[PDB]
Every structure is written in structure tokens, then in C-alpha cells.
Write a protein that binds this ligand. Structure first.
Ligand SMILES: OC[C@H]1O[C@@H](O[C@@H]2[C@@H](O)[C@H](O[C@@H]3[C@@H](O)[C@H](O[C@@H]4[C@@H](O)[C@H](O[C@@H]5[C@@H](O)[C@H](O[C@@H]6[C@@H](O)[C@H](O)O[C@H](CO)[C@H]6O)O[C@H](CO)[C@H]5O)O[C@H](CO)[C@H]4O)O[C@H](CO)[C@H]3O)O[C@H](CO)[C@H]2O)[C@H](O)[C@@H](O)[C@@H]1O
Length: 241
């Protein structure tokens, strides 16, 4: 339906790639499309990335560029938004005051863990009477087998069962970051996971939207397209619902 989206950046060919792959929505990790011209039928979803992203200007730009707002990117990691739950909660009224459908900050991991970043954020928000409309998640699988899709499914289910909010999957791929250098699947393994994972996600009623990381090989080695040419993963993503 309207689930299948992507993360994107303004490479030459971006408008053509977005249209080619059938992306119904996209985001850029910023408050506006960052120089991307969307094709017809493709919705831009703004993001407030971190603490210093929360300004009158970014929030006004966000509301002009879209109608759904993603909050901070991986506050739980020192290399990303690097924000305590309490700082996220104290900033939340400024995002909530936009009136837009509002995503939780996207935690890198452990969204189902009692006492973890999300769990303390959701508990604090409930106690303050704040609105959290949906939960975006991130997941990178280290097992490159046919078992990967069921592992992804179990994490999304776990988060759904804990908070009972609709789920978005805003960054996902196969990548192992457990070693000193990232480890990536073979092309065939990655295309097979694209096919199985999208079929699962399309059938899971509490998943609203999903976004493969990422549209371009200029962003990441798990990219779907190089310029306007899909690889076997882009072809599989194109063929997904
Ligand atoms: O607005 C003012 C503000 O602007 C910012 O600029 C924006 C810029 O920050 C943004 O950058 C994008 C970037 O966020 C994004 O990063 C991804 C990253 O999320 C990904 O992280 C992974 C984790 O996901 C992974 O988690 C693991 C998990 O899956 C597994 O299940 O469990 C593990 C258990 O712990 C777990 O760790 O862990 C690894 C290893 O640590 C992380 O690497 O990593 C990818 C790959 O490197 C990284 O790409 O990437 C986007 C694409 O590059 C960037 O775009 O981009 C915006 C638009 O350009 C900018 O506006 C400034 O940075 C702030 O300073 C400003 O104040």
C-alpha cells in the first residue's frame, strides 16, 4: 500500500531513483528535503535530528514541508543525537506544539528493554501526559541467513507489545557492526533479505511504514541504487508492495 519508503540524500539521479523504486515516502534526517525534488506521489517526512535541531525555524520549516514529524535520531548513541531521556522529554513540548503526527525518537537498539532509553522515554512521556503517536525503530541484522526476517519481526513485535503504538522501521538492513570494521552480506544474501523482509513488513498490520537504509550506494554500501541504476537489492525493493 503506502508503507514502502526510503532514506535519501540529494545525489544526481535522486528524483529518478525515488520514482523508479516506487518510494511512497522518504526522509532525509533533516527538517526539509535537503535539495531533493520529490516525484509525484512521494511524501517527504521531516526529522528533528537532535537537541540543536529544536528551533522555531526548524519546526516551522518541518511543518511547511510535511505533515508527520520524526524526532531525534539515536539519542542512545554517543555518535548520533547523544541525548538523555530527560533532555528529550524537556524538548518534547516544542515538537508536540507543531500539532503534527509525532514519532518517538528512534533508538539504535533495545527498544523493548525494561529500563532502556525508549522504555524510560515512553514512561516519562506517559507520566507527563505527552503525546507519542508512533515509534520508529532501527535494526541492523548480523545473521545474514533466511532467519534474519523472523529476527527483525520479533524485535518489532516486542516493541509493539510493550508500548502499543504503531511501528515505523526507519533504518534497516543487514550490517554487522560487532567487529572493528562493518560487515555486509553478499549481493544475493541482501537481495533475498530485501524480498523476505518487505513481504513480512507488508503483512504486519501494526507496521505503518518502513525505510531500507538507504536509497544510494553513495550513502552506504547497502544502497539500493548507484546513480539511477538499481542493483539486485533495488530491483527487489522496487518489486515489493
Ligand atoms: O539539525 C541540526 C543537527 O544536524 C545534524 O546533522 C544531520 C546529520 O547528523 C545526519 O546524519 C545522518 C546520520 O544520522 C545517519 O547515521 C547512520 C546511523 O544511524 C547508523 O548507526 C548505527 C546504529 O544504527 C547501530 O545500532 C546497532 C543495532 O542495529 C543492533 O541491532 O544493535 C547494536 C547494539 O548496540 C547497535 O549498536 O550501531 C552502529 C555502530 O555504532 C551505528 O553505526 O550508522 C550508519 C552507518 O555509519 C549511519 O549512516 O546516517 C545518515 C546517512 O549518512 C546521515 O545523513 O544527516 C542530516 C542530513 O544531512 C544532517 O542534518 C548534525 O550532526 C548536528 O550536529 C546538528 O546539531
Amino acid at each position: 500500500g503506502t508503507k514502502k519508503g526510503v532514506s535519501a540524500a540529494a545525489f544526481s539521479g535522486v528524483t529518478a531513483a525515488l520514482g523508479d523504486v516506487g518510494a511512497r515516502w522518504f526522509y532525509t534526517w533533516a527538517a526539509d528535503p535537503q535539495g531533493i525534488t520529490a516525484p509525484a506521489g512521494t511524501e517527504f517526512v521531516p526529522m528533528i535530528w537532535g537537541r540543536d535541531s529544536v528551533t522555531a525555524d526548524q519546526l516551522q520549516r518541518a511543518k511547511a514541508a510535511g505533515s508527520t514529524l520524526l524526532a531525534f535520531n539515536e539519542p542512545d548513541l554517543a555518535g548520533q543525537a547523544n541525548m538523555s531521556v530527560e533532555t528529550a522529554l524537556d524538548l518534547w513540548p516544542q515538537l508536540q506544539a507543531t500539532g503534527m503526527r509525532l514519532g518517538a525518537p528512534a533508538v539504535a537498539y533495545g527498544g523493548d528493554t525494561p529500563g532502556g532509553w525508549l522504555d524510560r522515554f515512553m514512561s516519562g512521556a506517559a507520566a507527563r501526559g505527552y503525546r507519542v503517536d508512533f515509534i520508529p525503530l532501527h535494526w541492523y541484522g548480523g545473521d545474514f541467513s533466511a532467519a534474519a526476517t523472523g529476527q527483525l519481526q520479533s524485535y518489532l513485535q516486542a516493541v509493539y507489545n510493550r508500548y502499543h503504538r504503531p511501528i515505523w522501521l526507519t533504518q534497516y538492513a543487514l550490517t554487522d557492526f560487532s567487529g572493528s570494521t562493518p560487515r555486509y552480506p553478499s549481493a544475493a544474501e541482501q537481495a533475498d533479505f530485501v524480498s523476505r523482509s518487505t513481504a513480512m513488513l507488508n503483512g504486519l498490520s501494526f507496521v505503518e511504514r518502513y525505510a531500507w537504509f538507504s536509497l544510494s550506494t553513495s550513502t552506504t554500501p547497502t544502497g539500493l541504487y548507484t546513480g539511477t541504476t538499481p542493483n539486485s537489492s533495488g530491483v527487489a525493493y522496487r518489486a515489493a508492495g
